[PDB]
Each structure stands twice: as structure tokens, then as C-alpha cells.
Structure 1
Amino acid sequence: AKVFQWFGSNESGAEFGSQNLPGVEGKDYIWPDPNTIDTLISKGMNIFRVPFMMERLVPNSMTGSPDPNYLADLIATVNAITQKGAYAVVDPHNYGRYYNSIISSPSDFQTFWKTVASQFASNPLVIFDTNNQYHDMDQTLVLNLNQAAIDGIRSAGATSQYIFVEGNSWTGAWTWTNVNDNMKSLTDPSDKIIYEMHQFLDSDGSGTSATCVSSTIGQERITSATQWLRANGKKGIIGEFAGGANDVCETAITGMLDYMAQNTDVWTGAIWWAAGPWWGDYIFSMEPDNGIAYQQILPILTPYL
């Protein structure tokens, strides 16, 4: 694995067009291309995070049965990643919400997670990610949803796999200590919780501009999260990060990762946002062979692979 336990990319597309449910495959959304994943594997990446919509995988009620077609494509994508030996993160890219309403039933969420984990229980290279970027919702609820997900996953017999938990405030690293302290209390009989945090480098942290605040902004924005993980005996991962293809952002990216590399007692690695087949000229596209980050950023990341 060289520098970090995990270093890789998001593989985005199956969650596209979230205003259109169920939406239409090939029109509103698309699954990752196994051939370009293989290229990224060949460059040394060993983790691929796969966003999908909860409502497309389990329509109508989260306690119901899966949609066969969307599930079949999730299964195929996971197997393409893991058959080679890399890790696949199963990411319900749902912001703590289901049909655009806050998930307020931990029991219902636990049933959803038993359903999903049952599909992958024997695969130790699957990582379950409780939900992408909880935000603007009750802090105790976020804790309880993460715990319910863990309980559902382990109840399915999926005991070998790591579980990525996410906090409130869009799971931002720079905001973590201000809001997410209660997340320290999560329990897991397999002792494989990783605290996933996200971090962008533009002024407001939204990850929507190619301009970075400064050449040190990434390393600055993760220092207090690093100390929190260490003080509480936890492990973390950066599950979503990017910067534009310019000198300032390239320096900020390297400085962030160099800082994480001297703090591997807590940091397990990082996952770029994003590859996937429908990004075109996106400022952060890691998609081989022509994404701008694949061409201009990947060369600066090779030291960590």
C-alpha cells in the first residue's frame, strides 16, 4: 500500500440526477466503467468509492426489497473492483435523507443496512459507508443513525469489513471538532470503524471552484480533526477531496497529504473526488484517459501510490 492503508478515487455516476427517481439508467445516471477502474488500479490506487442513491437501490420504503436492475449493477461494480484485490466503498450518497426527508427512524435505517450488507457479507474487501454527508439535522440523530447502520451490518454477518462512519456538517474535517464530538461513542464488535471526513480547498469549502485559498489551506483545515482522532483513539480517512489543476492547489494537495503521511497513527488514507464516466470537462475529473485531474493531478499523487 506504500504510504497509506488506502489511496484511491470516487467512482461517481450512479447517483447522478438525484431529482429524477427512479430515473433512467443511461439517461439520468450511469455506473462506473470497469476498464477505467483497471487503469487506476494499474497506477496504484487500491480503494474505489461508489456513490449510489438509496431510493434507486431500495425504492419506496427503505425497509423494502431492492430494485433488481440497480442492485445488479451495484454488485457488478463492486465485484469488478474487489476481484482484483482493491477495496470497494458502498456509499448511499444520501445526505442523511430519503425521498428528500431526514431519515428519522434508526430502526428503518438498520433494516436498510441489513438488506445491503447481506448482499456483500462474505466479501472482506467491501467497505460500508453509512451515508454521505449528514447535514443540517439533529446531532444525536446522526450518532444514532451511524450506530443503527453498524448494528444492521454486523447483524447480517458482515463482520470482516470496515465501516466508514460520517458526521454532521457535511462530514467536513475543518468543522469536525465544532459539531461532531459525540461521534466518539460509536461501538462496533468488529472494532473496524473509520471516521470518514471530507475536505475541499476553495474559500467556502464547497468543492465547486478550481481556485484554492492558499498553498497551505488543506493541511490547515485538517489539523484539529487529526488531534481529535488521536485524543479519542480513533482512525480516520479523507473520503472526498480535490483541488484545481493549478500550482497553488497542487502545492496545497501535496502539503495536505504530506501532513497526513506524518500522522498515519490516525490517517488511513484519502480518496479523490472524482472519477466516473460522465464528468467530461469537470475541473476535478480523475477519469482516464482525458480527465483534467487524471492528466495534471495524478502525477503529483504518484508519490503516495
Structure 2
Amino acid sequence: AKVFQWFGSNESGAEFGSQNLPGVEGKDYIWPDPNTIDTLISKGMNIFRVPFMMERLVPNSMTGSPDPNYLADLIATVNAITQKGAYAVVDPHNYGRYYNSIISSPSDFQTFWKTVASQFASNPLVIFDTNNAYHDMDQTLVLNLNQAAIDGIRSAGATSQYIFVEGNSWTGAWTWTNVNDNMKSLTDPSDKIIYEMHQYLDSDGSGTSATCVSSTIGQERITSATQWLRANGKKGIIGEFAGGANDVCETAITGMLDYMAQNTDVWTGAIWWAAGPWWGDYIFSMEPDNGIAYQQILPILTPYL
């Protein structure tokens, strides 16, 4: 029935209001609604990516103890996804930075990851995502941070779970081959690395405009990444993508997903940005029942589900 291994949505909210640390739940940030996740599951989605802030989960020093209350909501969100049989992606949505400084210690990052993985180590439907969208930082450091995360996760006995690794240049698919070639060297004793790339369809690829460049821009922008995955014997996932509810973007989205469906030897699937309870009239909202993408884009995603 389904075309891809995974197809689903980001569930954004716990990383909102990032200028306020620790911030206040219900005021600066909010966790996803399990009831609307249930609706997306009924439509055929089977993966939900859950952004959160490292600084809220493990305050002050990333080698320290977790904050019990923010951790409790991360756990509740994750286990509600997995109790339904869907995969939950644990995403420290941190851009390679902690208190807005580049994470320069792989050893500290490895300890952070042992701490996080230890909370989920027996749940095979959890997916660990090393960090969202590394950018503007040393390329060997990005490799070493991803490897430190893998090592920390596996050291906790979390050996059944997939690990989504992310590259530099905001992990963009269109920029992957000439920036992130060194990422092919990552190692995992469980052999469960998936290369997570992001792809937006507006002029600069920022995903801040509802206008897409053209009706073929998604396919165009992931073609070289597809060939890189195949040449290197790797698997990938599109962990964020979106376009506006308009004709050109819808055609680009269909074209991109149809191209991925012809290349499932390397593409494991795709994850829309974004659902979550605090989006309102956001141009990309996948939140049931009234998000614009839930109403107008989901019908073009259903062929893959």
C-alpha cells in the first residue's frame, strides 16, 4: 500500500519562543497534541519528528542532568506516537549550537546523547536525530559531532533504533554533494544510519515564502543528492520539506515525491514541515483539522500513503 518506508510530519511547538530559556510551557512553547497526531496516523502517516531545545531538556551544561518536567513532556509525546505504532523522531532542534555557541566538544555532545538515548533505549520506534540543520561551522566538526552522537546512543544500549544524521549547509539536499561528501565516513555498529536532508522550494531554499521557483524545482534540487546516496550505498530521508498551497508548488511537490518513488533504493521517505498546535494560518500548517496544508496538500500526499 504505502510507497515509502516512512512518510509523515514534523510536530513543532516545544522549540517555540527560543529566545526565552528555560521559558514557560503554555506561554513560550507547547508540546504536540496527541489527538491531532492520531488524525494524521488515520490518514496514513507513520513518522512524526518532534523538535525540542537542548537547553530546555538539559539546561546549562549538555553533560548535566535533564530537566524532569520538560523531559516528562518529551517522553509523553514520544510514547504516545509509538504506542500507536508510528515512529517518533527525537530532534534536538539546535543548529549545531548550544546557547547560540557552536558545539565544539564532541565528547560533551556524546555525553548529551548517552543521556537522551538512555531515556528511550528499549523503544524500537524511536529515531534519534543528531541535531537539526548544522550550518556555518567546520565540516570535520560536523562529521565528528554526528559520530559522537552515534557513539553515545549506542553506548546507552539503544541499538535497535535508526539514527538520522544531518549535514552542514542546513542539511540541504540541493547543496549536499559539494558540502557534505565527508559524511559518508560515519560508522554505526547497528548499521542504521539514515542521511536526513531538508529541501524547500522557494528561491533561496529557506522555506520562508509560499511561492515555489517552478513546477519541477523539487525534483531538480534532490537529483544530485539521490545520485550521491546511490554511489555511496547510503539511505536518505527528506526530514523537512514544504511548499505553499498553490498550483506551482503542488506540482513541484508531486514531481519531487514521484521522483523519490522511482528511487526508493535510496529514499526511505519524507517528512512535511510542519504540524503542531500553534501555527494558526501558517502557510505550511499540516495541523488537523484546519491547517492549510492539511486541507490542500494532504490530498496530494495521500497517493504515497
Question: What residue is the counterpart of 2:142 in the other structure?
Answer: 142
Q: Which secondary structure state, in structure 1, belongs to the residue aligned with residue 40 of structure 2?
A: helix
Deviations 1:243-285, CA, capped at 9 Å, x for gaps: 0000100000000000000000000000000000000000000
Q: How many angstroms does 1:294 deviate by?
A: 0.3
1:262 maps to 2:236: no
1:81 maps to 2:68: no
Q: Which residues of 2 match residues 49-198 of structure 1 at below 5 A?
A: 49-198=49-198
Q: Which secondary structure state, in structure 2, belongs to the residue aligned with residue 222 of structure 1?
A: helix
Q: How many angstroms does 1:242 deviate by?
A: 0.2
Q: How many angstroms does 1:2 deviate by?
A: 1.1
Distance in 1, matches of 2:155 and 2:303, equals: 39
Deviations 1:217-244, CA, capped at 9 Å, x for gaps: 0000000000000000000000000000
Q: How many angstroms does 1:90 deviate by?
A: 0.1
Q: Which secondary structure state, in structure 2, belongs to the residue aligned with residue 271 of structure 1?
A: strand
Deviations 1:77-107, CA, capped at 9 Å, x for gaps: 0011000100000000000000000000000
Distance in 2, matches of 1:87 and 1:184, equals: 25
Q: Which secondary structure state, in structure 1, belongs to the residue aligned with residue 224 of structure 2?
A: helix
Distance in 2, matches of 1:143 and 1:214, equals: 33
Deviations 1:182-209, CA, capped at 9 Å, x for gaps: 0000000000000000000000000000
RMSD in angstroms over aligned alpha carbons? 0.4
Deviations 1:135-185, CA, capped at 9 Å, x for gaps: 000000000000000000000000000000000000000000111000000
Distance in 1, matches of 2:283 and 2:270, equals: 19
Distance in 1, matches of 2:79 and 2:169, equals: 32
Q: Which secondary structure state, in structure 2, belongs to the residue aligned with residue 140 of structure 1?
A: helix
Q: Which secondary structure state, in structure 1, belongs to the residue aligned with residue 164 of structure 2?
A: strand
Question: What residue is the counterpart of 1:249 in the other structure?
Answer: 249
Q: Which secondary structure state, in structure 2, belongs to the residue aligned with residue 36 of structure 1?
A: helix
Distance in 2, matches of 1:56 and 1:146, equals: 21
Distance in 2, matches of 1:247 and 1:83, equals: 37
Distance in 2, matches of 1:210 and 1:78, equals: 30
Q: Which secondary structure state, in structure 2, belongs to the residue aligned with residue 240 of structure 1?
A: strand
Question: What residue is the counterpart of 1:272 in the other structure?
Answer: 272
Distance in 1, matches of 2:282 and 2:238, equals: 21
Deviations 1:58-91, CA, capped at 9 Å, x for gaps: 0000000000100000000001100010000000
Q: Which secondary structure state, in structure 1, belongs to the residue aligned with residue 48 of structure 2?
A: strand
Q: How many angstroms does 1:48 deviate by?
A: 0.1
Q: Which secondary structure state, in structure 2, belongs to the residue aligned with residue 198 of structure 1?
A: strand
Distance in 1, matches of 2:176 and 2:249, equals: 22
Give the count of matched residue pairs: 305
Q: Which secondary structure state, in structure 1, belongs to the residue aligned with residue 88 of structure 2?
A: strand
Consecutive unaligned residues in structure 1, runs of 5 or more: none
Distance in 2, matches of 1:79 and 1:151, equals: 23
Which consecutive aligned stretches of 4+ in structure 1 deviate over 6 angstroms post-superposition? none
Q: How many angstroms does 1:119 deviate by?
A: 0.2
Consecutive unaligned residues in structure 2, runs of 5 or more: none
Distance in 1, matches of 2:209 and 2:8, equals: 21
Q: How many angstroms does 1:21 deviate by?
A: 0.5
Distance in 1, matches of 2:143 and 2:90, equals: 19
Identity in percent: 99
Q: Which secondary structure state, in structure 2, belongs to the residue aligned with residue 16 of structure 1?
A: coil
Distance in 2, matches of 1:2 and 1:212, equals: 27
Distance in 2, matches of 1:300 and 1:181, equals: 33
Tell me the TM-score normalised to structure 1 length.
1.00
